[PDB]
Structure 1
Amino acid sequence: GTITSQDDNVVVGYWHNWCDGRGYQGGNAPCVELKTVNPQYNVVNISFMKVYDIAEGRIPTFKLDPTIALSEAEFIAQIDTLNSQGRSVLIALGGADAHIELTRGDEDALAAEIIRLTDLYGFDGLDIDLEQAAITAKDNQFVIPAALKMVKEHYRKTGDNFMITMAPEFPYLTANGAYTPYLTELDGYYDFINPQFYNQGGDGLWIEGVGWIAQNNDALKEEFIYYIADSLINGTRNYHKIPHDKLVFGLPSNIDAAATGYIQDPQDLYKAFDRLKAQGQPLRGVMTWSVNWDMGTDAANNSYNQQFIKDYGNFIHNQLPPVTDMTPTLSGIVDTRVELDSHFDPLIGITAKDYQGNDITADVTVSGSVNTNQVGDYLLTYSVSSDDETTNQPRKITVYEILPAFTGITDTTVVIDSEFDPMQGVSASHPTQGDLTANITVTGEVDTNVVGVYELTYQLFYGQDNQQNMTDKRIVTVVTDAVSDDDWQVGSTYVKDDKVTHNGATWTAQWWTKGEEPGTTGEWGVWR
């Protein structure tokens, strides 16, 4: 009747709010009554809360499929029995091809409906099972955690722990991955995460000395489970940290439950978990899609007969109780580049929380320092302690510099006796320092009274005391406006007294000529 939360190891099982689902291998998942769920599933997730009718608006809800042949009242009664047996029933938000698209300001209405349904049906919490576009559509990444923090606190004020769990597909758990916001904002509020280590085909990770470990590789399943979990529980190898006491391994029940990810030999899981326990970081449990699948039939109409809970139930429940990782969280620490001579403040952007979600940002301290007057790497150490633990994390701050740029320094032709200003159209700038046009000197001059080619060297001085320097060159050609005889052409015919220009001189033909180059005809030739 009241909020029944789990503090030991869990075996989580999703329950279909529909009948006769088709399997990836042509099997069939019947709907089942909640009360027929194997007792060793101590968390059962009602699938799914979603938007049923966009006529009702943007806020998802839950409507029982009547063809399961449970009345509203009976379904409440069966939740009530599971609760009386010390088992939890969660409402799972989302699902494959569920379309949730909330906008900022929707969070109060989402919190209110979660509370309505929880109090009506007797749910013990909520599983965030957003998939595909729903993870990142409109403002889901802000609205959902915001509503859920209001729900957690509403029930905390009556002494209840409304459970919050999540089922992210595992590749979304990398460090800046799509599920980041949900984990960081609900750090301290969530009870455990049960990612899906299924339906991701060849995705996985690279491990030195082993190679690439794919989620679809049966020959290395033990490796897959160990290494991805090890990465998760320590926040290594490009994964967000989920403490081991809050990490629940999500799996398909059988080959019909999912395209890939099914564990053919359960020994690979026993062995992985064991190795994790041997390094002092045992996991919190397992999760499966789904109890209907575990109670279904394959394509030959053979019953799966509870094979999943047969393989894992006892193995998970016979573990020691979990030991809470109470280490605090640090957030916002990223390697950063800082321009030479900028102001850098080591605390901007950085926050912290204790293992229960409380802001402890002012408790953070920093060791080491950055000199933004000198280029290079500076390494800092952040620390914060709470509940007799400390978390430390390092940060690399690189001080760099930026070249300024010249503009307007392009070769040009001007007419004899015009005015020429070497700085007209020339300028320089720098991102920080801004305008550096006054920092340009010019070596050389142009004499526009005298035809020819004039070279100018432009020197830009910048930075501290103008001791850095950039150089560019430019050619200014002074031409006459006076026109003159036509250029000689090899293909033309000339006659006596025709004049031509060629190789800077004016030549006069002495007689008929074609093809004779002025200057090449000697003392007594056709060109004079």
Structure 2
Amino acid sequence: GTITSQDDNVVVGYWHNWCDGRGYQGGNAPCVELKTVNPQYNVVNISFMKVYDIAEGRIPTFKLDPTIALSEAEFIAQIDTLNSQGRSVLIALGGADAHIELTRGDEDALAAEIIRLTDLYGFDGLDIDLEQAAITAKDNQFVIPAALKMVKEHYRKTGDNFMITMAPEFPYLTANGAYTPYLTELDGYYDFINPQFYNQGGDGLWIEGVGWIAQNNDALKEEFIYYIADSLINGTRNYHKIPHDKLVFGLPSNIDAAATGYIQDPQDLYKAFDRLKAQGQPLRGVMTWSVNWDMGTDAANNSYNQQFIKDYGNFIHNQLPPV
């Protein structure tokens, strides 16, 4: 394919390589064709690159799930289409039950596999989306960055910006937290980070004059967005620094998509984002788990009707370009 990178704001959505996932409130996430995904998702993350069978060894790979009833050639054609529209298609490495447990020395094979898949499908980059058990499994913290630096250099030789993004769960972004080796090794290689501000229950931060602000507190959602982002973009309040132009705020698309974290009132985001912008540190966009959920149904089979992209697409894409 052709490597198609993003230079401006992003609305990132994950795409399920499976069908009919059950939601946290009993809804359903269908498989969907890439051509069906709303065009305001300008980064779409194919979920997931993983180990499918230990007989194949340690190096993860990708296989389009036959249940989606899309041929590989047609999947590739649809990637092609997204790329013609200026949209990126990343491969997401990890996910639940991915069995990624790499040993030092595996970085050459992992880089080679990434390049092979990138060249085959036309992917534009890779998202590191490891499950909790994988963050510090075996030599993952060494191998995965080492592999990705080689990939990045490989495409730089031909003038292509192979995108590297990550989806850490936010509590692992404390100073010296478990995700920090990925971030420090890949500083100058990653394009943006889209942490998961969801599925962390009552984790959060204390702010003088406001009090305890949890990820699951709807009444303080503006404050949570603002302060957790402010902390990350400045490296304050015991968080590792992720520059604002490289920080994308990850959210569930709806209450089926994640156990906690859904933004009930989008104005809480609009206001938090505007405060970050006003202090000269606008964020780079939003991310969601997932396009399939945004296109999914609740327990009574009512369509979620693309409510996430309706709420945030225009808001994000109408902002000024990053610097």
For normalisation by structure 1, the TM-score amounts to 0.61
Whether the 8 Å CA contact 2:92–2:128 is kept in 1: the answer is yes
CA distance in 1, matches of 2:142, 2:182: 8
Q: Return 5+ residue gaps in structure 1 as ranges.
A: 323-528
Whether the 8 Å CA contact 1:198–1:260 is kept in 2: the answer is yes
SS of 2:168's partner is coil
Whether the 8 Å CA contact 1:97–1:132 is kept in 2: the answer is no
Whether the 8 Å CA contact 2:52–2:98 is kept in 1: the answer is no
CA distance in 2, matches of 1:172, 1:217: 20
Larger Rg: 1
Q: CA deviation at 1:133?
A: 1.0
CA distance in 2, matches of 1:140, 1:297: 36
Bigger RCO of structures 1 and 2 (CA < 8 A, at least 6 apart): 2
Please list the CA deviations of residues 331-372 of structure 1 after superposition, one character each: whole Å capped at 9, or x if unmatched.
xxxxxxxxxxxxxxxxxxxxxxxxxxxxxxxxxxxxxxxxxx
SS of 1:303's partner is coil
SS of 2:296's partner is coil
Q: CA deviation at 1:175?
A: 0.6
SS of 1:35's partner is helix
SS of 2:12's partner is strand
Residue aligning to 2:167: 167
Please list the CA deviations of residues 459-513 of structure 1 after superposition, one character each: whole Å capped at 9, or x if unmatched.
xxxxxxxxxxxxxxxxxxxxxxxxxxxxxxxxxxxxxxxxxxxxxxxxxxxxxxx
Residue aligning to 1:115: 115
Q: CA deviation at 1:7?
A: 0.3
Residue aligning to 2:20: 20
Q: CA deviation at 1:132?
A: 1.1
Q: CA deviation at 1:228?
A: 0.2
Q: CA deviation at 1:35?
A: 0.4
Whether the 8 Å CA contact 2:205–2:213 is kept in 1: the answer is yes
Whether the 8 Å CA contact 1:248–1:283 is kept in 2: the answer is yes
CA distance in 2, matches of 1:97, 1:239: 28
SS of 1:12's partner is strand
Q: CA deviation at 1:108?
A: 0.2
Please list the CA deviations of residues 137-175 of structure 1 after superposition, one character each: whole Å capped at 9, or x if unmatched.
000000000000000000000000000000000000001
Please list the CA deviations of residues 400-430 of structure 1 after superposition, one character each: whole Å capped at 9, or x if unmatched.
xxxxxxxxxxxxxxxxxxxxxxxxxxxxxxx
Please list the CA deviations of residues 95-136 of structure 1 after superposition, one character each: whole Å capped at 9, or x if unmatched.
123221000000000000000000000000000001111000
Q: Return 5+ residue gaps in structure 2 as ranges.
A: none
For normalisation by structure 2, the TM-score amounts to 0.99
Q: Could you say which structure has the higher helix fraction?
A: 2
Q: Could you say which structure has the higher strand fraction?
A: 1
CA distance in 1, matches of 2:97, 2:19: 17
SS of 2:311's partner is helix
SS of 1:275's partner is helix
Please list the CA deviations of residues 295-329 of structure 1 after superposition, one character each: whole Å capped at 9, or x if unmatched.
0000011000000000000000000000xxxxxxx
CA distance in 2, matches of 1:216, 1:180: 24
CA distance in 2, matches of 1:254, 1:58: 34
Q: CA deviation at 1:243?
A: 0.3
Whether the 8 Å CA contact 1:170–1:197 is kept in 2: the answer is yes
Whether the 8 Å CA contact 1:225–1:272 is kept in 2: the answer is yes
Whether the 8 Å CA contact 2:201–2:260 is kept in 1: the answer is yes
Please list the CA deviations of residues 66-116 of structure 1 after superposition, one character each: whole Å capped at 9, or x if unmatched.
110011110001000000111000000001232210000000000000000
SS of 2:15's partner is strand
SS of 1:47's partner is strand
Please list the CA deviations of residues 420-475 of structure 1 after superposition, one character each: whole Å capped at 9, or x if unmatched.
xxxxxxxxxxxxxxxxxxxxxxxxxxxxxxxxxxxxxxxxxxxxxxxxxxxxxxxx
Give aligned pairs, total.
Answer: 322
Whether the 8 Å CA contact 1:107–1:147 is kept in 2: the answer is yes
CA distance in 2, matches of 1:40, 1:272: 21
SS of 1:3's partner is coil
CA distance in 1, matches of 2:158, 2:53: 33
Whether the 8 Å CA contact 1:17–1:48 is kept in 2: the answer is yes
- Identity percentage of aligned residues: 100
CA distance in 2, matches of 1:25, 1:98: 24
CA distance in 2, matches of 1:163, 1:239: 24
CA distance in 2, matches of 1:301, 1:37: 19
CA distance in 2, matches of 1:181, 1:12: 23
CA distance in 2, matches of 1:70, 1:54: 26
CA distance in 1, matches of 2:218, 2:166: 26
CA distance in 2, matches of 1:282, 1:106: 38
Please list the CA deviations of residues 275-298 of structure 1 after superposition, one character each: whole Å capped at 9, or x if unmatched.
001101000000000000000000
Whether the 8 Å CA contact 1:24–1:257 is kept in 2: the answer is yes
CA distance in 2, matches of 1:111, 1:99: 17
Whether the 8 Å CA contact 1:51–1:59 is kept in 2: the answer is yes
CA distance in 2, matches of 1:98, 1:210: 40
Q: Indicate the RMSD between aligned Cα atoms, in angstroms.
A: 0.4
SS of 1:59's partner is coil
Q: CA deviation at 1:4?
A: 0.1
Q: CA deviation at 1:9?
A: 0.2
CA distance in 2, matches of 1:255, 1:3: 34
Please list the CA deviations of residues 256-277 of structure 1 after superposition, one character each: whole Å capped at 9, or x if unmatched.
0000000000000000000001
Whether the 8 Å CA contact 1:29–1:297 is kept in 2: the answer is yes
Q: Mean Cα displacement is larger for which, 96-105 or 290-299?
A: 96-105
CA distance in 2, matches of 1:267, 1:111: 42
Q: CA deviation at 1:58?
A: 0.3
SS of 1:213's partner is strand
SS of 1:281's partner is coil
CA distance in 2, matches of 1:321, 1:154: 27
Residue aligning to 1:38: 38
SS of 1:249's partner is strand
Q: CA deviation at 1:2?
A: 0.4
